[PDB]
Each structure stands twice: as structure tokens, then as C-alpha cells.
Design an enzyme around this catalytic site. Structure first.
Site, PDB file in Angstrom:
ATOM      1  N   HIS A   1      -0.895  -2.545   8.906  1.00 30.22           N
ATOM      2  CA  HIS A   1       0.534  -2.538   8.856  1.00 30.22           C
ATOM      3  C   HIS A   1       1.161  -1.953   9.962  1.00 30.22           C
ATOM      4  O   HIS A   1       0.702  -1.262  10.999  1.00 30.22           O
ATOM      5  CB  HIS A   1       0.922  -1.508   7.764  1.00 30.22           C
ATOM      6  CG  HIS A   1       0.336  -1.899   6.347  1.00 30.22           C
ATOM      7  ND1 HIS A   1      -0.872  -1.548   5.533  1.00 30.22           N
ATOM      8  CD2 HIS A   1       0.778  -2.827   5.418  1.00 30.22           C
ATOM      9  CE1 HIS A   1      -1.243  -1.992   4.475  1.00 30.22           C
ATOM     10  NE2 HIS A   1      -0.275  -2.872   4.409  1.00 30.22           N
TER      11      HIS A   1
ATOM     12  N   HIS B   1       0.992  -1.256   0.100  1.00 28.25           N
ATOM     13  CA  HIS B   1      -0.114   0.109   0.063  1.00 28.25           C
ATOM     14  C   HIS B   1       0.860   1.211   0.003  1.00 28.25           C
ATOM     15  O   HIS B   1       0.419   2.016  -0.679  1.00 28.25           O
ATOM     16  CB  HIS B   1      -0.943  -0.020   1.342  1.00 28.25           C
ATOM     17  CG  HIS B   1      -2.035  -1.066   1.061  1.00 28.25           C
ATOM     18  ND1 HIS B   1      -3.163  -0.828   1.706  1.00 28.25           N
ATOM     19  CD2 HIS B   1      -1.965  -2.167   0.405  1.00 28.25           C
ATOM     20  CE1 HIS B   1      -3.935  -1.811   1.486  1.00 28.25           C
ATOM     21  NE2 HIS B   1      -3.292  -2.720   0.769  1.00 28.25           N
TER      22      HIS B   1
ATOM     23  N   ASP C   1       6.908  -1.829   8.275  1.00 23.80           N
ATOM     24  CA  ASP C   1       6.429  -2.272   6.948  1.00 23.80           C
ATOM     25  C   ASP C   1       6.198  -0.770   6.198  1.00 23.80           C
ATOM     26  O   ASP C   1       6.583  -0.991   4.982  1.00 23.80           O
ATOM     27  CB  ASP C   1       4.996  -2.692   7.049  1.00 23.80           C
ATOM     28  CG  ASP C   1       4.982  -4.220   7.838  1.00 23.80           C
ATOM     29  OD1 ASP C   1       5.846  -5.122   8.074  1.00 23.80           O
ATOM     30  OD2 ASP C   1       3.819  -4.402   8.272  1.00 23.80           O
TER      31      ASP C   1
ATOM     32  N   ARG D   1      -1.873   4.504   7.442  1.00 26.97           N
ATOM     33  CA  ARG D   1      -1.735   2.986   7.259  1.00 26.97           C
ATOM     34  C   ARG D   1      -1.310   2.496   8.981  1.00 26.97           C
ATOM     35  O   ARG D   1      -1.942   1.489   9.441  1.00 26.97           O
ATOM     36  CB  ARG D   1      -0.632   2.283   6.427  1.00 26.97           C
ATOM     37  CG  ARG D   1      -0.946   2.262   5.008  1.00 26.97           C
ATOM     38  CD  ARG D   1      -1.867   3.369   4.240  1.00 26.97           C
ATOM     39  NE  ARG D   1      -2.175   3.155   2.909  1.00 26.97           N
ATOM     40  CZ  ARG D   1      -1.686   3.637   2.075  1.00 26.97           C
ATOM     41  NH1 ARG D   1      -0.578   4.048   1.908  1.00 26.97           N
ATOM     42  NH2 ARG D   1      -2.338   3.496   0.917  1.00 26.97           N
TER      43      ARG D   1
END
Lengths: 219, 219
Positions: A175, A136, A179, A169
Site C-alpha cells: 500500500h 486492510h 491509501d 502496511r
């Protein structure tokens, strides 16, 4: 619309990335503090912001970026930009992250702590997919850089928007912070690899035309 | 050689970067932990490697990247590549980071804990200069991406080396982990901006020739 390149012509993320932190690492302690920090504000506006940021459909991506680049983005007025948004999802989201993702198969925070994310609809898809690095965030980062290339006039707003995605995120809980950080670097590596692909240059030339067209400009 | 662009034509880093981690932040707690972990290995091999990475002089940069890109880099055999390395230090190390550095003037780790760094000969300069974001990391990232554009078949090695530089900077003790992360992103933002500048494209085209020239290849 045809992919700019094949899965094998991404740079091998498994080779260049360090492994993810074990439960004993200080980077993991940061990961989990940042997770519980984000979870503490469930329900709030910023949290709702994060649920909006978390959708990676092209329609949502377009609605977020359009005010940022200062031009309409839709399939009618900007057909090539519309294809570019989707092509870059495959290149940056999937191809660029795939071999590190599959190697480590990192377990996601919400699964580890048995909570729900800011976006429950996506949760079951995300369970099957290695956390690390964030596809993402590789995607939203690549997007910000390509658009900065096509519309340098709005580079600073694009880079700000690109950073803020990462905060969303981490808050949404699907996540870890680490990450996200690795995902950003992956997005830049893929961006560099795209510059050497003629088809990408050809498509970028048309995107630059659409987004700078006075007829497409906002307001 | 002349600069690819003026200081005004870098993207304003003060606009798009977040403020650095402050006293109570988990990221800041992580910054300290990663600092302690790096000073604790003073004197080791890794510390000696970090001491060598810390020197951003063009001669040292060229020595490090030579085996990685797989060609000779020197003023004689690769004159434009030599100029390119110097140009990108100015673009990435200085112009790209300048407004955020000046605005925050973040204190460096070795000063906050009354220690030496891995490269004491450079400590006098570094004292004068705000830590955040890291110009050394913005630069080493920009360089790794630009060379990946020139020899895309060495992209995985260049991507790895670019990451490792960051780890050396944290260990050397002149930068916090959060400076290094922010510097990586800055380097990517400058990389996108350079794509739009004809002088950079002209210069990259010569670099590509020099570095793929059979007389210059190397392992």
C-alpha cells in the site's frame, strides 16, 4: 454467522473520498519517499514485525489483538468475538472500500517498482485489487474502534495498536501511505454506519460480555 | 447542557498518537509543500471557502452542516442538536486532543513562515495553542460521524463534508497536513468512547427525533 449488512448498505466511498495523487503531486512524492524508506529496512526486525501485521486471517488478528484487549480471543472461549472479527473483515475490508477501489484501480507500489513485499504469499491476490483506499487499514481501524467500544478500559492501547498497523502496511510495500490514510477514515465511516444496525448492536452486546468476563481476562 | 464526560474520560491522545513530523521527515517535507500550495492560492474562491470553514463558532458550524444533514439547526427548532454541537466541541475539540497538544506544543505553519492565515481575527488565540493534533479537525470529524448516526441516509454527504474541512484547514494555514490527519483519527477515537456513555445515547436519541421531524426537514 450472517453479515451485518449488504454491500449496498455501506457508505459509497467513491463519493466521499478525493481521487488518489498523480505522479506530479506532492502527496505522491511523499508516497514514494515513504515507500523507499520502508524498503530500505527490508530483512530487519521491524520489517518482520510488518510481515506479522500484514496477515489478515482471523487467527492472526486474534493473536495480535488479544494481548491488546487483555482477554483471550479464540473460537472456544469467545465465540461471538470470533464471529465479529470475521464479519468486520467483510464489512470494513471489502464492502466499505469497494466502489472507490474499483473506480480508480490504483497500482500498488511493489508492482510499480518491481520489488517484492514483506509478504510474498499474498502478492498475487493483491495485484488484482485496487490499492486505494486500503481495505486492510479500514479493517484494522474499524476493529480497534469496535473493540474500544466493547472494552473502553483498554481504549488507549487499542488506538495505539490501530495507528501502528498503518506504519506496517506502508513498510510492507503493498500500500501507499495515502491509501493507508484514506483507509483509516473509511474505517471510521463504516463504524458510524454499524451503530445504526440492530444486528450489530445485538452482537456487540455479547462481545462486551465475552471480553469483560473475568474468566476470559489475561494473566 | 452538561458535558458528556470529564476531561479524564477522553482517551489519552499523548499515548496513542505518534510524535509530529520533525525537521528531516518526509511527512514534514510534505507538510511544507502542502502549506506552500495552499498559500499560493490566497484570495481565490477556494480561499474564501476556507475562510468560512475556519470559524468553529456553533452558529457557523450549524450553518454549514444544515444543508448537508438536510434539516434546520437552530436553538429554537432543534434545542438538543444545538446543545449536542456545543458538547462535541468540548469533547472533541478540547478534551480529546489536550494531552498531546500540551505535550508537543507544535508550532503552526503561518508562524514558521511569517505569514497571515485565512482568518486573521482568530490568529491571537491560535498562537497560544499547540497545532498537533488538530482540535478543529477532531471536532468536525466527530460531528460528521455523530450526525451520520442520526441521519444515516445523508452519511455520504456528511463523510464528504468532513473530509473537505480538513482541506480547508490546510489551505487556511493554521494547521499542517499531519495535524489534520491526526485530528481525524482523534475524532474517531472520541466517537467510539462516546458510544459507551449513557448521557450521549440519551442525547443522541433526541437529536435523531429533532432531525427527522417533518417540520425541520430541508434541502
Amino acid at each position: 454467522m450472517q453479515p451485518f449488512h449488504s454491500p449496498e448498505e455501506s457508505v459509497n466511498s467513491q463519493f466521499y473520498l478525493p481521487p488518489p495523487p498523480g505522479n506530479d503531486d506532492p502527496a505522491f512524492r511523499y508516497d514514494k519517499e515513504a515507500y523507499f524508506k520502508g524498503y530500505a529496512i527490508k530483512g530487519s526486525p521491524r520489517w518482520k514485525q510488518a510481515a506479522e501485521d500484514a496477515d489478515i486471517s482471523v487467527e492472526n488478528i486474534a493473536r495480535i489483538f488479544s494481548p491488546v484487549v487483555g482477554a483471550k480471543i479464540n473460537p472456544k472461549d469467545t465465540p461471538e468475538t470470533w464471529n465479529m472479527l470475521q464479519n468486520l473483515l467483510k464489512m470494513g475490508g471489502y464492502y466499505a472500500t469497494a466502489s472507490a477501489k474499483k473506480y480508480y484501480m490504483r497500482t500498488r507500489p511493489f508492482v510499480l517498482f518491481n520489488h517484492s513485499t514483506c509478504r510474498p504469499e499474498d502478492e498475487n491476490t493483491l495485484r488484482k485489487d485496487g490499492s486505494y483506499p486500503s481495505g486492510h487499514d479500514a479493517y484494522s481501524t474499524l476493529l480497534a474502534l469496535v473493540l474500544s467500544q466493547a472494552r473502553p478500559e483498554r481504549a488507549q492501547e487499542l488506538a495505539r495498536r490501530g495507528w501502528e498497523f498503518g506504519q506496517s502496511r506502508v513498510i510492507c510495500g503493498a500500500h501507499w501511505q495515502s491509501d493507508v490514510d484514506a483507509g483509516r477514515y473509511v474505517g471510521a465511516v463504516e463504524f458510524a454506519r454499524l451503530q445504526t444496525i440492530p444486528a450489530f448492536q445485538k452482537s456487540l452486546a455479547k462481545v462486551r460480555e465475552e471480553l469483560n468476563d473475568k474468566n476470559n481476562l489475561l494473566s
